[PDB]
């Protein structure tokens, strides 16, 4: 049952990019990461999604890696209409 906790920790350069990959998403899609973070991090469920403030430095590895593989799934698909 350790696979979920065995996911490697998101490094600084990854975290920074993650907060960026996440912010690349359309508003609706950041509704997912807030949902992930808020659920995985019971410490920030007071933050309302419309006024969310996520702390990438408080998130546990699994959350950060969930956030990533998620946005990565959105961004690698159809989400680059600018560049």
């Amino acid at each position: 049952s350790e696979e979920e906790d065995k996911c490697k920790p998101m490094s600084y350069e990854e975290k920074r990019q993650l907060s960026l990959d996440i912010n690349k998403l359309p508003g609706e899609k950041l509704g997912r990461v807030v949902h992930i973070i808020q659920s995985r991090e019971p410490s920030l469920k007071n933050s309302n999604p419309d006024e969310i403030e996520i702390d990438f430095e408080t998130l546990k590895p699994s959350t950060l890696r969930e956030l990533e593989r998620y946005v990565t799934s959105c961004l690698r698909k159809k989400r680059k209409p600018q560049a």
Partner: peptide
């Protein structure tokens, strides 16, 4: 880092 400034203002906007 990724507080209300970056997140919220890229989120709500």
């Amino acid at each position: 880092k990724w507080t209300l400034e970056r997140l919220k203002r890229k989120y709500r906007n």
